[PDB]
Write a protein that binds this ligand. Structure first.
Ligand SMILES: Nc1ncnc2c1ncn2[C@@H]1O[C@H](COP(=O)(O)OP(=O)(O)O)[C@@H](O)[C@H]1O
Ligand SMILES: Nc1ncnc2c1ncn2[C@@H]1O[C@H](COP(=O)(O)OP(=O)(O)O)[C@@H](O)[C@H]1O
Ligand SMILES: Nc1ncnc2c1ncn2[C@@H]1O[C@H](COP(=O)(O)OP(=O)(O)O)[C@@H](O)[C@H]1O
Ligand SMILES: [Mg+2]
Ligand SMILES: [Mg+2]
Ligand SMILES: [Mg+2]
Lengths: 372, 372, 372
């Protein structure tokens, strides 16, 4: 039977059938609830909107995210999202297809235990398997050795792998991703005169950041040019209500927080520093191959001139006799799903599944012995 | 049982059976009392005239309005008007038909409480329901999203609704309607030589205003043309006593007070300004749909070239990327009654009624929990 | 030379000499313009009234506020207000005294730039300095560590400070203050039968709110008692025209919007929630001292039983091993001015000034490098 690949994250959720080269259903993971009285008798209303319907009618809805920092806070909303994905988006019965789920490294055991319990006791799936996102990201690139720098919506992590062997003592994870960048962008916009506070305004700011941001090679030079050639940097954006907003110096000052987290008041190191620290925790003979297979993945790495900036930063830290090559292939925003689809279509993988009998006999703890 | 739709307002009262496409009995809400001695023995006189009879014999009667600014002042006259409507106009027993009444937004609770008490303890109606006029006006147009600008005889209000959800924090109401326009018309007529003071003269001036008024697209240009091409604007009107009156520049100077209330010494803003302020109090993503569904209702909006003037005024305020469409359908003077008839004929509405038992047990305050 | 302390806000403006323990001139910041024709030849009239004169003759004047949400909208009115303060109230020459101005956090740069330009190019002040209001509020209390919850007329903000170091990433600001409470009070009064629309009526409602409002410890219990013991809550107030108004349940329902902004249709969180969120954004070891130094400031915090309510609300959120102490000293409505006077009288502060030469050489942008 064809397996279901469901990559659930903080911001977006991707779902599809194992065997394709692109996800089938990509939708935001939000739950909307009405806050205004209903007075028009005759129409059929709903108590909760999930997915695109919640985003379209966000004007009269309060929006909640059931996943924060890769950890599920409310399980009812997550169960509703899973039900919507299975019964509305994919329109496939969740009882004849094995499930392949993804999880971030260094997560509490209770999250996996509850996820497995919900999958086996609510949807009654035949089999399921949970895998780390970095492994699937490395699978999607068709390589066996490299360091994966993944940056999603809530969690950014770094995982090195050498010749199919992972080094768990050199795995890094920090909670600083596109959401903090959106908050920083809102704070920067408050200095221009525009104030955004509501959830709909937050989505508008997120869209503005996605459409009109880039990474400057030299931050100081562009900052100097911002006060002298602002006409080149200014960009006009049309708000949904018809007003116009001028985005100027905020185009590159917002993504700069990745390489200097002190702007947003975070003591954690930057991205290049984290990668260098992760490389230096491995053996001496392993570092040479890791320096040449830096793979980028995640939606937060979809900016412009990011690979060149990362290469320049790594050059000033790595020894002058090494070769640094950053791998930023196109369509890398769906690399995890592609890797999961590739993994699920292998004959050797057809044995590493958690069947119903094993879960019923051993219990929910079996996920700590067969899934890694 | 067929329900009774009774829209009672300041100037006129409409009444009919739920299921028709037009009101059955439309008559002015006035109470007439004699002021001259009666010396002709042999005829059967009456102590009070209500409705058309009071208007026909207004020469020897003093006329009183029991409703002012949507608030009932004297309840005896209102009870007499209700009795006349039930027993003379409709000729139906008010004990086998549910009643559907209308009320203006932002009204005192005591008005609703006394109305419900009178309906349940005097006419002994089986069930009753009170609804806002804007909701019925939006029902009559067959829409679910829009901003309703209602202007009756004493009260003009603005209510936005988005996808069946009303925003109570963006509801406006001002006490400036056709009565102030009639007073302004009388004041303008005093400058020509004609003086009107009595109630009958007030009704004559109201008829003149109804028959010979229009809204000028450019007030300044027509004002300039008034002193140079008066022959085009002059109109002859025949008074009931046979005299002739020339209405000239007063044709467009009287309705102009809607867009500039400073003419009649009122500090409240105009109509377009009020609509724009009501639109700007909603969320950013809601404004686009509200700008495209401006619905006009009420008897005061039955002038000529009013939709074009409103569109031109809104264009200069709304952003240059929005589409403004004013909806002024024909027969809009009875839109509230049509909406009430449509609402009362729905199966889903057959449950939202205040039965006799509920009123007797809970008390008169129940109207504050089941009627909105 | 003695410095001038001028705290200009939305509602009121305070001005005095640095060295005193109380402001010298406290007057509303309104600009009045006549709207009626003048027919009495022989009297000397004025084209605009500013301050108490505008408030006394508000019957025949239209009143405008030149400051909205801590942002100056019209600069001509603000310049007139500054001229009135310097030349009429204080009666001191604005050329031999340094100026100390106050500003709210998270404000546009253009506001400060224009303020400095006006101060240096119109009044020709020798030196000036702009400071945040929270810093002065903390100075006035004689402390070094604490969280300041300031609530004025248009803007309410929260600023934590630990041992003289401010945490900019934990500063909150929302636009919800006494003006929205006045609007809510007017809306509540419309349900009793009284309608207030004009600016003079708005000032009357503001006075009623100032004189007859208090905060209920248990909102539900007092709401239940409102429908059973209204005689205890009813209060008689005398309108300027001689009529009497009964204020009953509206005494505590108006200030309740601070702890539940959903009543006035605002999605922003309440006051205790905002304070708790601001405390949780600091480091773990800093929270203990912040929980014990909650300082209240502003005119909107001059209600009754507000400290006890805030303490009770914070107790249910803070851990059961912390000590919560709300600091609400008397005369806290002028805390900002007292703090500014204390700061301006220090010898160490005699160097942090913007002289004429520095402004002339560097330009208006210098205020972004020496004032914080
Ligand atoms: N073209 C783009 N440019 C800049 N940022 C982007 C772009 N596309 C997406 N993003 C950011 O990436 C985030 C999406 O992260 P995603 O990888 O979907 O998280 P998850 O791994 O939980 O699904 C969004 O919050 C958005 O801000
Ligand atoms: N054709 C017309 N042209 C101009 N004004 C009109 C016209 N018809 C009615 N009016 C005005 O509308 C008013 C009637 O208001 P109406 O909607 O009946 O009030 P209510 O909602 O209380 O019944 C009258 O006072 C009259 O001046
Ligand atoms: N005793 C009081 N009780 C309740 N509210 C008050 C009292 N005194 C003042 N206020 C409110 O505080 C507001 C004054 O705010 P203020 O601190 O003067 O603003 P700013 O900081 O801009 O000068 C007024 O709008 C008033 O409604
Ligand atoms: Mg991801
Ligand atoms: Mg009407
Ligand atoms: Mg203040």
């Amino acid at each position: 039977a064809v397996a279901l690949v469901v990559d659930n994250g903080s911001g977006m959720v991707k779902s599809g059938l194992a065997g394709d080269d692109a996800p089938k259903c990509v939708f935001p993971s939000i739950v909307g609830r009405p806050k205004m009285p209903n007075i028009m008798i005759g129409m059929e209303q709903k108590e909760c909107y999930v997915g695109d319907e919640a985003q379209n009618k966000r004007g009269i809805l309060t929006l909640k995210y059931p996943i924060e920092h890769g950890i599920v806070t409310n399980w009812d909303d997550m169960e509703k999202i899973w039900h919507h994905t299975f019964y509305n988006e994919l329109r496939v019965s969740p009882e004849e297809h094995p499930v392949l789920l993804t999880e971030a490294p260094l997560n509490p055991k209770t999250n996996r235990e509850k996820m497995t319990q919900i999958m086996f006791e609510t949807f009654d799936v035949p089999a399921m398997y949970v895998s780390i996102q970095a492994i699937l990201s490395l699978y999607a690139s068709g390589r066996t050795t490299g360091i994966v720098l993944d940056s999603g919506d809530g969690v950014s992590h770094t995982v090195p792998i050498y010749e199919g062997y992972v080094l768990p003592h050199a795995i890094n994870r920090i909670d600083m991703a596109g959401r903090d960048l959106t908050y920083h962008m809102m704070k920067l916009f408050t200095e221009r005169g525009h104030t955004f506070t509501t959830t709909a305004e937050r989505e508008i700011v997120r869209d503005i950041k996605e459409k009109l941001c880039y990474i400057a090679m030299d931050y100081d030079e562009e900052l100097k040019r911002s006060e002298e050639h602002s006409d080149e940097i200014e960009e006009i954006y049309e708000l949904p209500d018809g007003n116009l907003i001028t985005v100027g110096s905020e185009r590159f000052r917002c993504p700069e927080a990745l390489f200097n987290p002190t702007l947003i008041g975070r003591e954690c190191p930057g991205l290049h520093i984290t990668a260098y620290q992760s490389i230096m925790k491995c053996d001496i003979d392993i570092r040479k191959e890791l320096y040449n297979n830096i793979v980028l993945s995640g939606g937060t790495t979809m900016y412009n001139n990011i690979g060149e900036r990362l290469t320049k930063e790594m050059t000033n830290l790595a020894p002058s006799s090494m070769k640094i090559k950053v791998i930023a292939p196109p369509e890398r925003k769906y690399s995890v799903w592609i890797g999961g689809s590739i993994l699920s279509s292998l004959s050797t993988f057809q044995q590493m599944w958690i069947t119903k009998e094993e879960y019923e006999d051993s219990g929910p703890s079996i996920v700590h012995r067969k899934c890694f």
